[PDB]
Amino acid sequence: AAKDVKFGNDARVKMLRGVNVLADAVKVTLGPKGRNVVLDKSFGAPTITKDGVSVAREIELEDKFENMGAQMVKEVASKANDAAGDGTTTATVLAQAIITEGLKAVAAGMNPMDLKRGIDKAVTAAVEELKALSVPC
Amino acid sequence: AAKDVKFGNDARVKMLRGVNVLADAVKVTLGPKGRNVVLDKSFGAPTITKDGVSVAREIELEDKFENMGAQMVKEVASKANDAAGDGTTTATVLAQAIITEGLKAVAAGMNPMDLKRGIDKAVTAAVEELKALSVPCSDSKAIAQVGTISANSDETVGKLIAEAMDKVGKEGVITVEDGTGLQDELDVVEGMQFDRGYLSPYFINKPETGAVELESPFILLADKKISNIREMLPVLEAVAKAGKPLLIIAEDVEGEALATLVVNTMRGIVKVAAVKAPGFGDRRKAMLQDIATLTGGTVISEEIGMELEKATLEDLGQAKRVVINKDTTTIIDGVGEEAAIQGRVAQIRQQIEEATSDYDREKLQERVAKLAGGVAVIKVGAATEVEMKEKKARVEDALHATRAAVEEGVVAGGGVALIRVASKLADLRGQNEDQNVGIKVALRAMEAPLRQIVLNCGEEPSVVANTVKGGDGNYGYNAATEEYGNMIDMGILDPTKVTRSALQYAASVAGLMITTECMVTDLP
Amino acid sequence: AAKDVKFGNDARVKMLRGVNVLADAVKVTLGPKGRNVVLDKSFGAPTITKDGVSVAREIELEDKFENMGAQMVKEVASKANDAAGDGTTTATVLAQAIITEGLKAVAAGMNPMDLKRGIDKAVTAAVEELKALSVPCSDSKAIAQVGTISANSDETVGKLIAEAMDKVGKEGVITVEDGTGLQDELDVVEGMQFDRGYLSPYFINKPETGAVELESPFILLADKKISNIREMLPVLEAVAKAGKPLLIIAEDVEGEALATLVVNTMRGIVKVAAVKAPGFGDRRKAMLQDIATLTGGTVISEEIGMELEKATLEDLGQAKRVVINKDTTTIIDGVGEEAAIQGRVAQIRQQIEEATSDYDREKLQERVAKLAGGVAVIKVGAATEVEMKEKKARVEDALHATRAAVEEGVVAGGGVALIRVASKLADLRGQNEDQNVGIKVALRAMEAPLRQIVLNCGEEPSVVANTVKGGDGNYGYNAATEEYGNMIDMGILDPTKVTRSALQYAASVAGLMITTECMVTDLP
Amino acid sequence: AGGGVALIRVASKLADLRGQNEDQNVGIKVALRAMEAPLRQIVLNCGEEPSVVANTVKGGDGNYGYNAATEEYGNMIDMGILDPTKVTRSALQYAASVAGLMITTECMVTDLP
Numbered sequence A: 001a002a003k004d005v006k007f008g009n010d011a012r013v014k015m016l017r018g019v020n021v022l023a024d025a026v027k028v029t030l031g032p033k034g035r036n037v038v039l040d041k042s043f044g045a046p047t048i049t050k051d052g053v054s055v056a057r058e059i060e061l062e063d064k065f066e067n068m069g070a071q072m073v074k075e076v077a078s079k080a081n082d083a084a085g086d087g088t089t090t091a092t093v094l095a096q097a098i099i100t101e102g103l104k105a106v107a108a109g110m111n112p113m114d115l116k117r118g119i120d121k122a123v124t125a126a127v128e129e130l131k132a133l134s135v136p137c
Numbered sequence B, C: 001a002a003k004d005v006k007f008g009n010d011a012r013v014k015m016l017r018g019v020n021v022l023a024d025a026v027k028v029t030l031g032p033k034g035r036n037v038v039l040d041k042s043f044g045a046p047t048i049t050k051d052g053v054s055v056a057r058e059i060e061l062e063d064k065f066e067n068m069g070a071q072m073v074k075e076v077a078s079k080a081n082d083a084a085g086d087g088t089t090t091a092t093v094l095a096q097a098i099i100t101e102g103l104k105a106v107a108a109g110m111n112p113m114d115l116k117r118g119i120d121k122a123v124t125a126a127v128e129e130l131k132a133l134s135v136p137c138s139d140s141k142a143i144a145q146v147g148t149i150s151a152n153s154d155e156t157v158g159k160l161i162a163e164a165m166d167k168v169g170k171e172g173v174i175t176v177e178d179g180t181g182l183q184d185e186l187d188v189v190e191g192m193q194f195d196r197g198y199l200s201p202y203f204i205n206k207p208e209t210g211a212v213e214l215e216s217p218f219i220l221l222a223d224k225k226i227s228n229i230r231e232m233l234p235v236l237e238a239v240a241k242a243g244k245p246l247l248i249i250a251e252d253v254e255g256e257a258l259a260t261l262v263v264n265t266m267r268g269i270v271k272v273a274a275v276k277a278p279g280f281g282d283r284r285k286a287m288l289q290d291i292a293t294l295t296g297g298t299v300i301s302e303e304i305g306m307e308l309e310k311a312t313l314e315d316l317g318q319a320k321r322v323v324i325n326k327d328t329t330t331i332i333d334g335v336g337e338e339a340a341i342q343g344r345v346a347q348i349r350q351q352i353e354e355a356t357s358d359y360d361r362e363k364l365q366e367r368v369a370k371l372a373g374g375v376a377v378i379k380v381g382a383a384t385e386v387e388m389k390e391k392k393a394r395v396e397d398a399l400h401a402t403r404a405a406v407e408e409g410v411v412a413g414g415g416v417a418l419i420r421v422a423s424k425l426a427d428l429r430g431q432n433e434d435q436n437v438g439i440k441v442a443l444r445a446m447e448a449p450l451r452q453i454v455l456n457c458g459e460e461p462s463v464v465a466n467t468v469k470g471g472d473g474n475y476g477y478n479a480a481t482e483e484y485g486n487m488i489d490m491g492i493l494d495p496t497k498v499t500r501s502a503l504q505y506a507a508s509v510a511g512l513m514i515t516t517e518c519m520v521t522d523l524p
Numbered sequence D: 001a002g003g004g005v006a007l008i009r010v011a012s013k014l015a016d017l018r019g020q021n022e023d024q025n026v027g028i029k030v031a032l033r034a035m036e037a038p039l040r041q042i043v044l045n046c047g048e049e050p051s052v053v054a055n056t057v058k059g060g061d062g063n064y065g066y067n068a069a070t071e072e073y074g075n076m077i078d079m080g081i082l083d084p085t086k087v088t089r090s091a092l093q094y095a096a097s098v099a100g101l102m103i104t105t106e107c108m109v110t111d112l113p
């Protein structure tokens, strides 16, 4: 089908709104003072959960682009679940977080690709860090 | 009046589009090889021109808000020229430059307060650099130099200019009048000038100048605020049958008497105009008197029981000419007896004896200056009445630049000076990263003028720009000839003053917007 | 007034449609076999005509912008005729020609700055070529020659014209007046002329001429700027009961007194008109005097105290006729005593003794001329008043061309001259390829006129053009007879001057647009 | 040599190539001109003057080339910035093969909206 291409800032923005929607919808359920969300269902009665990934999956946006961004972040929340079935909400938060800042810096005029690397490394670093702190349960 | 109110972006975005139009419309006329714009005239054939000032003048958008954004720029860009004699355009160009980027930033998520800060610094810094790059202009050489150049090669021009200042001084008051014959004429005559603008634009008789030229009119020297028109009737009619214009000077003029004259003039019988008096309080006292002295006019002090209805021409002063602009009045050749004039001087001079203060001595001093200092005049000689008034124009131009040139020296004028200073402080950093960006924007914005010219000349901006960064000093590119070199030597420069002015003003407004969070206006 | 603003193409495109209309509408009437247009009249029957000038006149589009494009051309195409006596249409025709292609180019991606350049070159060059091809016109032979032709075969016409210049000279001042009887009449009478147009179109009383013919009115010779009406009252009333018209001459006239007379005449009691005085400053002094002398009028110098109110008919000058146009005043038969007149001459003559300057000697000389020279007049004789005034028309026409023919000679007039010159410099190249194209457009655009004529005649453009290229010199195709040959020998030519004018003017405006990047106007 | 230097390089080499008629010479010039595309798109993807670099790069010889990653010129090969000859060649051919035709369109047919 005929497409609709978007470049730079416009694209990004849309993409971000998309992320935010999803994100914001999964944040609410973080922590002991976390709240619930209701997923409608034509099936039977609506569902009430505090499971981040359960939520993510239900999110789909009308705006093709806002939707795309949502459909992407959605996967971290996802993979995180396949990995260890928990931390989902949490994971999401970080992305939302990372991306927000990231874009702002691209908007700042930085080469995104290095931004990527800076982050990647910063992470590889963070990991050992944890493995350090990890203490036997 | 119910208002329409916008915030944050909603607000800023409008302001941006608004500004852009103005700049996109006025910038295309920058270089010596600028393109032209067509300004539709209501009656008759449209107008083609490459004069940004004119273009700008006409710009007014339908979308209020967007229209504000524009007017905001126009205002300060005008102020620039107001206090430098040019740049009007340039300032605008830069204005955009900054605003564009910085405004993306804010909207990008960065902090506005810093962005502004980061810029101001960049400006602040660059301003200095300019001081450095600036090349003095003092000796009569440098004077006729710049003049003749700004006069467009014409040496005879830069000539008289240097001669002139060489008479009443650099701070001397010089004027211009059409030549009677083919020969130029420089003459010094009893006269004076001061900072006090007309009380109504509806007084301007010289539209393209926004000034008021009056032929040897009579001169009034009141002492009170003129609200009512009555008092005038006697004299107003005396000068009415006197078939001559008339100027006024007093505390002020309330519409009652004010508004009337404005109309009385704009398509009216006796056509005249007035302006507030110099000095305030005790100062104005003598201040006006001096004027009486010079014009040989009588001073109507209510502190004397003397009124206006009680006054005849015998009480009015006189001068062969006088012109007022937005905010400056200046007379030419007062009929007061040298005896008197020179005498008055003796009085004051003595008075300085007290010298009981460096302000009071300085003050009495200043007065002396005006009065005895005199006003130098010029008569642009020419074959044809066309070339005549035309040449007359180029003269007043140059004069400007020169005054400025003097004041702060001069620098590379192809937008060069800026490129330079920018490449200079290219490391300059700020605390908040939001300030660094602030600074970049600022700097990268100074490349705007040059880039634009190159562009207007159909040349490669990025390329020329680059190579100019390469060299140093006043080494630049002459768009007019497409040859690089010493812009100054090549006769391409800008009075240090203006370049700064322009840049500062643009900076001013830019942050001003970048810090604006609300906008109010009427409803469509 | 909030404006509407367009840029680049948006802008240019509008301008283009705008112009096309104008051109597509006026062009169809070019050839001797042109088609006709219908100009709807508000009251009554529409008007059919083949006169481009009239057509053009009526053109005004709704779409502002588009309309500008149109008015922009009309303006300069008019100026063309203004300074040549014809071409008005042709210019327009070329105008389009260029604008069309070059505008595609710019829009095609090519550089505008160059395109213009390339063109200007082409023009510049062709203009010379024209000088070459031009056939002198000097002896009274050539003179009557061209005259009788431009008078449409009528030899009698070309005759007088030669006679005329043969009297007061080529630069002599010649005028026309309806004949009193059946015979033509050429007479020389004390008279004068000078470049100075009326200060209000609302003075014209000869619409079809845009001129103002006055019958033996009185003449005012002031020396100041008349702003207030007052001063006139005395004299203005004298002439009111004097039952005669009145002309004015002085510095200028401000609406106060001006705007008043304009209405005072356009459907008003005393019907008169005025024009500034020749020369500026010192010059005007004697200048006006010379006139006074010739009209037996009194000069009112405020530098003498004498005011206007302080003046009677005894102070007015007089002449049997006098006509003014957009920018020129010319009097006929002034009542000044020969003794007086001739004497004044003596004065001037002597004065030329100083010979202290070739400009001052040249100057004095010029006055001598005006004054002692005289003004030749003609009276178109005729049987019917129709033929009468008709012939008269044809006469004034011829005279134009003739003056022009004299000044710059003449050339092939079927659009021929252009075809020629174009085929000539057919290699002519430019630096940027964008300049070559620039040049092509230019050249190919010169084929316009011819092709259009043929077209209008219902003939094959491409074909005729081709075969015209083949030949050389003034060899062309007579659309009117469909026979090729020596356009000049065939009595088909154009005063070298006009052809150039047309072509330059069209070029002018074309590039002007090709370099336009913005357009401003009011909102619908 | 990568960075689209190779092409820009061979372009200078055909600075004197001509054809049967003028149009054709333009045709040629057109193509050489286009061979600076790769290079300056790369540059432009670095927020830098495509035209400025290109120049400096054209001023050089052999494998003198701008290094976008390092933002400094030098020998593209010694820097290990290599383009398999074959691709570079296919890219140019396939590109031209269609481009060529495309610019000879005078009419186009398709269905209605």
Ligand SMILES: Nc1ncnc2c1ncn2[C@@H]1O[C@H](COP(=O)(O)OP(=O)(O)O)[C@@H](O)[C@H]1O
Pocket: A029, A030, A031, A032, A034, A051, A052, A086, A087, A088, A089, A090, A091
């Ligand atoms: N009582 C508590 N006080 C503070 N933080 C807590 C407490 N209990 C749990 N947490 C933290 O909150 C996190 C988020 O829990 P949750 O909302 O289930 O998100 P996720 O689905 O990502 O685990 C836990 O991993 C832990 O770090």
Ligand SMILES: [Mg+2]
Pocket: A086, A087, A088
């Ligand atoms: Mg959990």
